[PDB]
Amino acid sequence: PTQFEERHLKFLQQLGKGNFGSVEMCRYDPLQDNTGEVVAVKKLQHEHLRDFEREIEILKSLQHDNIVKYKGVCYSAGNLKLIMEYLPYGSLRDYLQKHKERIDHIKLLQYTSQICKGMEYLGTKRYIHRDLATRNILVENENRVKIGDFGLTKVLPQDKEYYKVESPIFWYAPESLTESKFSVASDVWSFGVVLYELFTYIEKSKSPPAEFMRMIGSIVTHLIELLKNNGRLPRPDGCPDEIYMIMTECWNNNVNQRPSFRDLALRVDQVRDNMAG
Ligand SMILES: C[C@@H]1CCN(C(=O)N2CC[C@@H](S(=O)(=O)c3ccccc3)C2)C[C@@H]1N(C)c1ncnc2[nH]ccc12
């Protein structure tokens, strides 16, 4: 299993930077002749470290067609780097925004289903993702996506069905906003927002922050109040009613009335099969 000399990990370009960390595109190049393979490298910037070492083990334990591949780690005596496969097509968020004129609903629902299957899988390990958004989805090719970040992922406790813990508040279930509770259910609410993002094709004027801030008129509080009076993101221009209905069932205030991911992949596969024509 793959073992990495820090010394031969050559920085090529910056892929994402945050509050406490970053993702780089590096080439691992032991033969020093630039024929090494390109990888993605996650590092911390300024217990985070405990959380980072859990993340590594989570990603490692995942092996799935729609989850980004763990490659190994890279350390200094005694500046931890998590190594993953590099997917050159980049995030679905940017890829959708780019090729909207070549990506019909059939494609949209393919990605949607591959996202559910990945999430279904996470659930089999009681993993809660916590950050479901097009931002964190990668495109392997035109017909395949992978969930590409597990920064916030948690393992549920063995006797419980929720984990209590800047947050992307416009993607969050209300119980996440008010009780900091995270669950399969809250992953489902967020999935609904992913479905919303996909069918707006990332039109900046139609993003969850823009529409929610519009409907609002502490931002967080305003959001809680809005969600509680059944305010919701509108149906995207051109969205079929069955896709919007899946969204509104994901955004049910009651955790227990939200659909399962196995059910979501199913309905979504049947709606995609009914458009094939
Ligand atoms: C879309 C991907 C997931 C998201 N990622 C990103 O920008 N983030 C993940 C971590 C955070 S962070 O590092 O900014 C951060 C760290 C700590 C606290 C807070 C923030 C942002 C970009 C990735 N990307 C473009 C890639 N492109 C090609 N192949 C890839 N393989 C693996 C990733 C990847």
Q: What is the 3-state secondary structure (H, E, C) of 32-45?
A: CCCCCCEEEEEEEC
Report the relative pairing of strands 38-44 and 81-85 from DSSP bridges. antiparallel
- Counting ligand 1 atoms within 8 A of each CB, the residue from 13, 14, 23 with the most, and so the one to mutate, is 23
Amino acid residing at 200: T
Q: Which atom of ligand 1 is nearest to the CA of 40?
A: 31
CA atoms within 13 Å, Cβ hemisphere of 253: 10
How many angstroms separate the CA atoms of 277 and 269, rounded?
15
Q: Into which CATH architecture does domain 87-273 fall?
A: Orthogonal Bundle (1.10)
| 18 labelled binding-site residue | yes
Please tell me if the CB atom of residue 20 comes closer than 6 angstroms to any atom of ligand 1: yes
Decide: helix, strand or coil at residue 76: coil
| 164 labelled binding-site residue | no
Look up residue 101 and give its DSSP letter.
Answer: G
| 19 labelled binding-site residue | yes
Burial 110-126 (b: 16+ CB within 10 A, else e): bbbbbbbbbbbbbbeee
Amino acid residing at 124: T
How many angstroms separate the CA atoms of 227 and 208, rounded?
13
| CA 33 from centroid of its chain's CA atoms | 35
Domain 1-86 in CATH 3.30.200.20? yes
Report the relative pairing of strands 137-141 and 9-18 from DSSP bridges. unpaired
| 78 labelled binding-site residue | no
Place of tokens 């985070």: 48
Residues known to be catalytic? 131
What residue owns the CA closest to ligand 1's atom 20? Answer: 18
User: Tokens representing 33?
Assistant: 């002749």
Please tell me if the CB atom of residue 11 comes closer than 6 angstroms to any atom of ligand 1: no
Taking the centre of ligand 1 as the mean of its atom positions, its distance from the CA of residue 41, in whole angstroms, is 9
User: Tokens representing 124?
Assistant: 């089999």
How many angstroms separate the CA atoms of 169 and 220, rounded?
7
Q: Which residues contact 77 (CB under 8 A, 6 or more apart)?
A: none
- Give the residue from 72, 74, 40 showing the smallest Cα distance to 57: 72
Asked whether the bond before 18 is cis by omega within 30 degrees of 0, the reply is no
- Give the residue from 214, 227, 226 showing the smallest Cα distance to 254: 227
Alpha helices in the chain (DSSP H): 48-61, 92-98, 105-124, 174-179, 184-199, 208-216, 219-228, 241-250, 261-275
Q: How many CB atoms lie within 10 A of CB 85?
A: 16
User: Tokens representing 132?
Assistant: 């479901």
* Deposited experimental method: X-ray
Angstrom CA distances, 182 to 32, 55, 76, 103, 187, stand at 46, 17, 34, 32, 8
Range list for CATH 3.30.200.20 in the chain = 1-86
CA atoms within 13 Å, Cβ hemisphere of 201: 14
Amino acid residing at 56: I
Look up residue 67 and give its DSSP letter.
Answer: B
Q: How many CB atoms lie within 10 A of CB 102?
A: 8
Sign of the CA dihedral with 132 first, then 133, 135, and 139 last: positive
- Contact present, 232 and 196 (Cβ < 8 Å): no
Place of tokens 């069905």: 161
Range list for CATH 1.10.510.10 in the chain = 87-273
Please tell me if the CB atom of residue 67 comes closer than 6 angstroms to any atom of ligand 1: no
Taking the centre of ligand 1 as the mean of its atom positions, its distance from the CA of residue 214, in whole angstroms, is 29
User: Tokens representing 5?
Assistant: 């000399």
- Give the residue from 89, 81, 93 showing the smallest Cα distance to 24: 81
